Design an enzyme around this catalytic site. Structure first.
Site, mmCIF file in Angstrom:
data_model
loop_
_atom_site.group_PDB
_atom_site.id
_atom_site.type_symbol
_atom_site.label_atom_id
_atom_site.label_comp_id
_atom_site.label_asym_id
_atom_site.label_seq_id
_atom_site.Cartn_x
_atom_site.Cartn_y
_atom_site.Cartn_z
ATOM 1 N N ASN A 177 0.842 -1.236 0.008
ATOM 2 C CA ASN A 177 0.133 0.018 0.188
ATOM 3 C C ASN A 177 0.806 1.135 -0.069
ATOM 4 O O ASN A 177 0.470 2.350 -0.778
ATOM 5 C CB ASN A 177 -1.133 -0.092 1.007
ATOM 6 C CG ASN A 177 -0.630 -0.341 2.416
ATOM 7 O OD1 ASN A 177 0.616 -0.402 2.689
ATOM 8 N ND2 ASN A 177 -1.405 -0.381 3.404
ATOM 9 N N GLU A 179 3.915 -4.372 12.177
ATOM 10 C CA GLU A 179 2.927 -3.374 12.288
ATOM 11 C C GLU A 179 1.798 -3.785 11.236
ATOM 12 O O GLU A 179 1.894 -3.873 10.039
ATOM 13 C CB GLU A 179 3.624 -1.771 11.598
ATOM 14 C CG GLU A 179 5.027 -1.738 11.683
ATOM 15 C CD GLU A 179 5.415 -0.872 13.252
ATOM 16 O OE1 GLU A 179 4.958 0.459 13.185
ATOM 17 O OE2 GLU A 179 6.011 -1.232 14.118
ATOM 18 N N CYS A 209 -3.482 0.975 6.560
ATOM 19 C CA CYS A 209 -3.412 0.373 7.860
ATOM 20 C C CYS A 209 -4.018 1.172 8.762
ATOM 21 O O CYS A 209 -4.723 0.698 9.800
ATOM 22 C CB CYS A 209 -1.929 -0.044 8.386
ATOM 23 S SG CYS A 209 -0.648 1.065 8.036
#
Ligand SMILES: NC(=O)c1ccc[n+]([C@@H]2O[C@H](COP(=O)([O-])OP(=O)(O)OC[C@H]3O[C@@H](n4cnc5c(N)ncnc54)[C@H](OP(=O)(O)O)[C@@H]3O)[C@@H](O)[C@H]2O)c1
Ligand SMILES: NC(=O)c1ccc[n+]([C@@H]2O[C@H](COP(=O)([O-])OP(=O)(O)OC[C@H]3O[C@@H](n4cnc5c(N)ncnc54)[C@H](OP(=O)(O)O)[C@@H]3O)[C@@H](O)[C@H]2O)c1
Ligand SMILES: NC(=O)c1ccc[n+]([C@@H]2O[C@H](COP(=O)([O-])OP(=O)(O)OC[C@H]3O[C@@H](n4cnc5c(N)ncnc54)[C@H](OP(=O)(O)O)[C@@H]3O)[C@@H](O)[C@H]2O)c1
Ligand SMILES: NC(=O)c1ccc[n+]([C@@H]2O[C@H](COP(=O)([O-])OP(=O)(O)OC[C@H]3O[C@@H](n4cnc5c(N)ncnc54)[C@H](OP(=O)(O)O)[C@@H]3O)[C@@H](O)[C@H]2O)c1
Lengths: 456, 456, 456, 456
Positions: free
Chosen positions: C133, C233, C267
């Site tokens: 992303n 993460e 995210c």
């Protein structure tokens, strides 16, 4: 106002370079009143804008590097090789300010029923007074952190080599235009130090004095400054100690640099060398012989190691001091010799009661005292100053002991007192000064803490 | 010295409690000379030992807790409940210095082929000068950090409330003896402040001045100190702001305390209340009503909320400032009454021009000004001072704007100006002072940095 | 290598752009062996060299800004204007790592008879595994601090958008060549993440995994990594909360951004919106109206606000989730339409039991819940994740309560969950991750402390 | 419960001292489940209460000082004088944690349009697992910071010396009772490590494992912990290097302590001595001579230097390790004998391939390798571990070269590897562990950062 009031001298050719304006006390006052009107704007200038301005100054200094170095050669007598080094350091100094604007940390303190946090805010007007010897980098070390902390600036550069500061002021003007900041946030006030520099010190509208220069002017400033934050970086007679177990070869090389860089016109120059009696003869000989081969002349010449002193009048004063030193029983080993302001590398063996052990000469004049290890600290601490000291030894215990007992703002091990990494905290104790420079450290000096308490 | 020279007065009964020594300027010079001879001993005192001394002081203060509070009541006129709180905080201050001796961090700076690290060393002799109002804790805030950083101390306490400081000097003495440290590292010098304290300010052997007291003397110290580090905690006319969206009951309770604790004789006491026009009548009614029923009388009485001012002289002078404020158009809402040194809670509504907006009364006198929001910051900032301010609101955006724009060392949100957590950095801007206290912050003022560089 | 094994897809056109190598487990083992040979060279690389390499990467990225942004648009399907922003952020990241090489501070600890200081040294081999992303800037956030702390790198990029990483690898190769550092200190390993990435995770020569990606893979890594430092993460269903007192126009504007930047494929994208019942109809109206006029289509087009999802297969999955959300009683307010991978802005009203409250869709699908304030924290905290949350309010006490009570790695007040300032510590709690990124913080993870004790 | 399931042995006399509870896996599950019910309570406990609890713990430990020491002798076999020192350190540990709850700082990060600050919050449930050797101080190093940071604790202590942890659990229960905190916030779970310890590692409700013990169990944990923060402090074979310029008297004395304190059963005990060959015979002679006169026997006797090993079974294994070392050509210089669990100071001269160079024996068994300086770093670094190392020299450059190149969490110069100052960061690299202890560092591992962004 662009008048032409004051002579700028090439210290090598003694020729007049150009004429520049010399402000009157009344014009200095006006300049300060004008600077005060811009306080609110500097205070509120966003982080990004401060970062951009500082980055742009560094960019301009880089693009004009060679021009600036030539200027340092001609105006300040700085050998062109050393001049390029001063410029590269000014680049890094502005660059480092830019990043500290982005990265400077405040703190949160724990409380049962409160959020307590700190905020840094400008002291307001920063009055910066810079010397002739590293006028670009030393100006960077005041200007960059002042801008980083939202301060308005009135700046008096040394009349002995003002031209590079004039070029930097225009560079600053340029960056301010680019990012739409009124030009009144920075103000270069050239003229007589005891007038324009003094007005900055006395004027109740300047909030902080950041001064680098002579001890005598420094000490006066403490008495005249009044209710202002005060930062002082003054000189010293910087003792460099060579113990019997030193690497002599490396100690000599390091001490040639620390002795004769910029003809010894540096606040952290070698001021005296204390050498163990048992190796004293071998050290003195090697040192004298390496100093013999230094090329002494035109700072514009690439091959030149040592250029002239800042003026004939200082060179003439140094000649007297050297005469007084021989009179007290000093043994001349090299030099003691000058053509106009071009002063030759001069080395004397003296005792601890010599005039050279108490006098910062700002000259390539080096006294060597042969001594026992037990007297070394006593002699080292025997001055009123406490800027930098150095020791050459391979012994852990001795180095730790000397490092703790030397009463100085900096202790250098296995290099001369001359060392300064720019991002290190730097300054003196005793009569050598007040406060620390180095961008991060100057930023803390050029700001006040505000404590904010939020009750839950 | 066994001399009984100078009366010490009970501010309630106006009786002499006893007579203490009053040193001459010569005796102050001689005491400073003595302290100089112990600089090396303090400087080389191991961490464990400074820790032990500091902890043992706290321990003795805890043991004598109730006596020391009574001394505050009798000597300083501090109501007994408030005196117990001061004692408690001074315990906390000495224990906290003890922990910072062991925990205080120095730094390492990255370098190619150099190990660069810092070391804090004491300034040398710390001249500490303390006021009458919180003489135990304010002493603790200078003494505790001075000991932690290896300094020798010469200390002058306020003649208006010296007795607790003499008890602290006896506690310190015990601690020093217990851990076999010469007693000359700590020196209490009583007598006239403008003689004894002035010598401390003026003597060239004193390396740093830490002063808490009046602004008149503060400003004078900046001109007389000369070549020393200077820390000043002066007063202020602390503006407390109540916006229209504030919680009224909570604001009133907070401002009652801020105004009347120790009869307003605190450098961070409420100096003016600024209240929005739309809620001003409701606030003033509620505020006045809570003030009414406060018990005024003997500091020794568990029931007493407000005790006497420090002197008759000062109270008479306060009464003059009130009459003058009424004569300017000030509307009296409560009190204005006075029996000898005992000054009753006094509230007035005034305009921004009233003498009270520009005078630190150090008395239970509260000027209240109604106004619009857009005028609050201007009024608050309109003074020469910049110690503490406070804002009462539930509005995030307004609290942030006020916190950023109030020109003060401290901004308190939803509690009054009189808040201080001992471990927070603490101090003023503008004429309100220089540097920060709180043990950790004072330690950094009371030490000099040494930069050590090892060439690899 | 030079092999063409694996399709790389344009998510907008669904065409094969090119084919890139797909390394076997053996080939990844080999690259790791090779990387291991260069540990001592990276560990010993001077500050100056690391700084130069890092600044040179930043410089090359700046010069290829547009080419790089276009690759992101074509390969990751990122609207061109948003792609320019990622590129720009990646420059800042490398630049800030360069500064941290020069500035990172170690500490000195007080001791009675010892010098105690710290020193940071590389973990060894950093295994970096990055997502589709923000493949450029998230790679930067692993590589830059890895290089700054003297680690050798093995890095697997997402197979869904590998091209910009292959361009970044060439850039790194150029910087290494320019400063005479062997190429094997950084290794881009392309192919099946479950083969190549898994080998990074499993291989005992790797000293540290830094993984950004899905929960399913992250959770597996914790069981498979073994004896290595782990940083994860992962994602989250990020709740954004609108209290009744919020500025609705600012809230909507902020939420539109947080919801629809990169088609919700971030995210920290908005996962649910909790809105107070009293303002819900007005908030919904406004939000839906702004979302209608968003331009959906080709990311190469300057006009495009919202481009396609990363694959058809995922778009197809989202459609089913949305159809499941509607069956559960969800009310469709906008969109729900799909064209191949191009998913339209979809808004539903739901209750807390709805599948969308527990599902990170990585899609422009926004569930809105109308509820009361005292239920908001519970609903917000009701998931297994805890990356980011946001709250819109002008109430000091409520913002403080919510900031404290939200069980999240980050709490944004008056902007959406999507805020990340690159220089801030960033990461999640619960199943959302381990450790923090942002260059300074990542440097701490990618180095180990060494405590050095010198006995005096 | 009052159960008597498990024999607790006195390792000197081999007597059962008592029987204590051994929990089943199921009871461990229930204790973790109950612990979880208390997460909110701990997390919301105010600073002041955490401080009070911590200090009250310290206080009780001090009042029961001698008792706890005798327990350590009887249960752990620890000579009484060394037992006192362990108690005294545990006191300091709880006090320092108390200090840090009040003084721990978070940061503020600059931003144009945002206020950005951090907050530490508890990880949740901390699973502490401690070993037999310093069961009191090592427990303190996990529990004290765990309370400081608002965590619930489940704690398995070593079955080999549980008695002092039982006393500490009661002290904690007392402290908790006093300040009205539920007893469920701290839970001591006794029993088999492979049952109770293992359930703490595996259980999905435990958020963090802090483990100190053997490398073999530590390695296991990394495969079984799953998604938790992991901190490990394992052992190693700690190399101590004696250069030819070392002060041999000081080296000998330091190395006797580092070798024989607690019969070599410290994770940082001397594991090997590397000595320059030109001084090997002198050093070996003096070292063996000093070792000869140590008093081996009953830990309760004040005269006792060396008590027994923790079990006969371990002593029997060590015996077999020594025989293997001799078989490989090792030359026995002293000891190599035992009386049940009492193992005598044992010294051997070996080469670098000897089994003792690769085995942590947890025994008073010392291999010495004579070598040349330039092989020493290689030999020191040639194990799989990386806890502590030490070098003895007075040579500045060598000490620096070794300090930098020794691959270890700690390097001691002029004292043995045994050195640990409790306030320093402590821990290993390679297979010697993960994460650092020391109260302040443990606090950072036992809390998560939260980033809070307020938009302006
Ligand atoms: O020459 P130098 O470097 O050897 O050292 P210096 O005389 O102390 O000069 C250092 C700097 O201070 C200025 N200055 C001199 N006298 C001053 C005064 N009385 N008040 C305020 N500033 C003053 C100088 O200006 P000028 O060089 O213009 O005198 C120069 O900029
Ligand atoms: O009473 P207050 O708190 O309202 O204010 P203050 O007069 O400024 O008193 C504060 C402190 O400063 C001392 N002091 C007074 N005049 C001084 C001077 N000229 N130089 C140095 N120190 C001086 C005072 O000692 P004394 O109280 O002994 O005068 C007291 O310890
Ligand atoms: O798809 P997505 O972006 O939603 O998230 P994701 O699959 O978790 O992708 C994140 C990163 O992890 C890699 N990866 C996938 N499976 C892995 C595994 N079993 N072990 C190690 N790394 C693995 C991916 O490589 P790939 O994209 O090549 O699978 C990608 O680079
Ligand atoms: O013996 P030592 O001190 O040399 O070191 P050790 O065996 O590693 O023991 C250190 C600690 O870990 C525990 N432990 C042992 N096996 C475990 C396992 N499989 N999972 C979790 N914890 C375990 C021990 O409990 P026990 O002493 O009860 O086995 C002891 O409390």
């Amino acid at each position: 106002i662009n008048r032409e009031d004051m002579d700028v001298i090439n210290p090598y050719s003694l020729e007049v370079i150009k004429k520049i304006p010399a402000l009157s006390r009344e014009e200095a006052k006006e300049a300060i009143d004008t600077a005060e009107k811009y306080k609110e704007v500097m205070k509120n200038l966003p982080i990004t804008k401060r970062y951009n301005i500082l980055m742009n100054i560094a960019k301009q200094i880089k693009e004009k590097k060679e021009e600036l170095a030539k200027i340092l050669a001609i105006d300040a007598g700085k050998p062109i090789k050393q001049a390029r080094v001063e410029v590269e350091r000014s680049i890094g100094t502005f660059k480092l300010a830019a990043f500290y604007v982005k990265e400077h940390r405040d703190e949160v303190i724990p409380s049962d029923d409160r959020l307590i946090f700190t905020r840094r805010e400008p002291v307001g007007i920063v009055g910066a007074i810079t010397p002739f010897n590293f006028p670009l980098n030393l100006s960077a070390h005041k200007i960059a952190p002042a801008i980083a902390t939202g301060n308005v600036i009135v700046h008096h550069p040394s009349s002995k080599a003002p031209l590079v500061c004039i070029e930097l002021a225009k560079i600053i003007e340029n960056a301010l235009k680019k990012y739409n900041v009124p030009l009144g946030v920075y103000n270069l006030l050239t003229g007589a130090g005891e007038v324009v520099g003094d007005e900055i010190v006395v004027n109740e509208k300047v909030n902080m004095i950041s001064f680098t220069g002579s001890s005598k002017v420094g000490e006066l400033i403490t008495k005249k400054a009044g209710f202002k934050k005060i930062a002082l970086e003054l000189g010293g007679v910087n003792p460099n100690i060579v113990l019997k177990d030193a690497d002599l070869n490396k100690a000599v090389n390091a001490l040639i640099k620390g002795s004769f860089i910029y003809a010894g016109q540096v606040c952290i120059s070698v001021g005296m060398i204390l050498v163990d009696e048992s190796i004293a003869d071998k050290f003195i000989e090697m040192f004298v012989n390496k100093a013999k081969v230094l090329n002494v002349g035109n700072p514009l010449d690439e091959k030149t190691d040592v250029g002239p002193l800042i003026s004939v009048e200082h060179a003439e004063w140094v000649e007297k001091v050297v005469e007084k030193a021989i009179d007290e029983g000093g043994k001349l080993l090299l030099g003691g010799k000058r053509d106009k302001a071009l002063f030759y590398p001069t080395i004397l063996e003296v005792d601890r009661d010599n005039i050279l052990c108490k006098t910062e000469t700002f000259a390539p004049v080096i006294p060597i005292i042969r001594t026992n290890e037990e007297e070394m600290i006593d002699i080292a601490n025997s001055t009123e100053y406490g800027l930098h000291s150095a020791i050459f030894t391979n012994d852990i215990n001795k180095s730790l002991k000397f490092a703790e007992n030397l009463e100085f703002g900096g202790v250098v091990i296995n290099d001369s007192s001359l060392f300064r990494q720019d991002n290190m905290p730097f300054g003196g104790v005793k009569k050598s000064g007040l406060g620390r420079e180095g961008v991060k450290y100057a930023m803390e000096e050029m700001s006040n803490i505000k404590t904010i308490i939020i009750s839950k």
